[PDB]
Structure 1
Amino acid sequence: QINLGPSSNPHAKPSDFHFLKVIGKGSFGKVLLARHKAEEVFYAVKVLQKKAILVLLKNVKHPFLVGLHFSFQTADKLYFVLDYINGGELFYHLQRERCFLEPRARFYAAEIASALGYLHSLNIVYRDLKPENILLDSQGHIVLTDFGLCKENIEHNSTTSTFCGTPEYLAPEVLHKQPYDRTVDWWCLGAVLYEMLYGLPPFYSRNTAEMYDNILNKPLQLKPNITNSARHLLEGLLQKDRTKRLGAKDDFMEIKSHVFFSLINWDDLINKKITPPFNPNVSG
Structure 2
Amino acid sequence: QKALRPDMGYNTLANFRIEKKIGRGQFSEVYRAACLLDGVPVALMMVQIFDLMDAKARADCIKEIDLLKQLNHPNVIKYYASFIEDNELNIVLELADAGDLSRMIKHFKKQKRLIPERTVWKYFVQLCSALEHMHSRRVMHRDIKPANVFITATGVVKLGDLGLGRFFSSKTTAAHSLVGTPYYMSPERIHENGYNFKSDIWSLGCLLYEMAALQSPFYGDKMNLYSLCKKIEQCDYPPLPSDHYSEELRQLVNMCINPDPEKRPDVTYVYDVAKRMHACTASS
If the TM-score is normalised by the length of the shorter chain, which range does it land in? 0.7 to 0.9
Deviation at 1:108, TM superposition (A): 1.6
Within the candidate set 227, 242, 253, 1:234 is matched to: 253
Partner residue, 2:132 = 117
1:13-92 to structure 2, matched below 5 A, reads: 13-51=12-50, 52-53=52-53, 54=57, 55-56=62-63, 57=65, 58=67, 59=69, 60-92=71-103
Give the residue type in structure 2 aligned to 1:146.
D
Give the residue type in structure 1 aligned to 2:257.
L
Instruction: Provide TM-score, normalisation by structure 2.
Output: 0.78
Instruction: Provide TM-score, normalisation by structure 1.
Output: 0.78
Partner residue, 2:149 = 134
Deviation at 1:231, TM superposition (A): 1.3
Deviations 1:214-249 (A, max 9, x none): 11125343132321111111111111112122x1xx
SS at match of 1:69: strand
Tell me if 1:217 matches 2:234.
yes
Farther-moved stretch of structure 1 (188-197 vs 30-39): 30-39
- 8 Å CA contact 2:218–2:236 kept in 1: the answer is no
How far apart are the structure 2 equivalents of 1:70 and 1:194?
35
Change (3 A) 1:199 1:87: same
- 8 Å CA contact 2:130–2:158 kept in 1: the answer is no
1:266-277 to structure 2, matched below 5 A, reads: none
How far apart are the structure 1 equivalents of 2:171 and 2:27?
8
Q: What is the count of residue pairs matched by the alignment?
A: 252
Tell me if 1:207 matches 2:226.
no
Q: Structure 2, unaligned stretches of length 5 or more?
A: 1-7
Deviations 1:174-232 (A, max 9, x none): 11211211110111111000000001101112323222221112534313232111111
Change (3 A) 1:256 1:38: closer
Give the residue type in structure 1 aligned to 2:126.
E
Deviations 1:58-106 (A, max 9, x none): 2212221111122222040121111110221211111111242111111
Give the residue type in structure 2 aligned to 1:173.
E
Change (3 A) 1:79 1:155: farther
Give the residue type in structure 1 aligned to 2:150.
L
How far apart are the structure 2 equivalents of 1:179 and 1:39?
41
Deviations 1:235-269 (A, max 9, x none): 11111112122x1xxx23321343x541446xxxx
How far apart are the structure 1 equivalents of 2:240 and 2:48?
46
Q: Structure 1, unaligned stretches of length 5 or more?
A: 1-8, 266-273, 278-284
Change (3 A) 1:20 1:82: same
The structure in which a higher percent of residues are helix is 2
- 8 Å CA contact 2:11–2:81 kept in 1: the answer is no
How far apart are the structure 2 equivalents of 1:11 and 1:140?
29
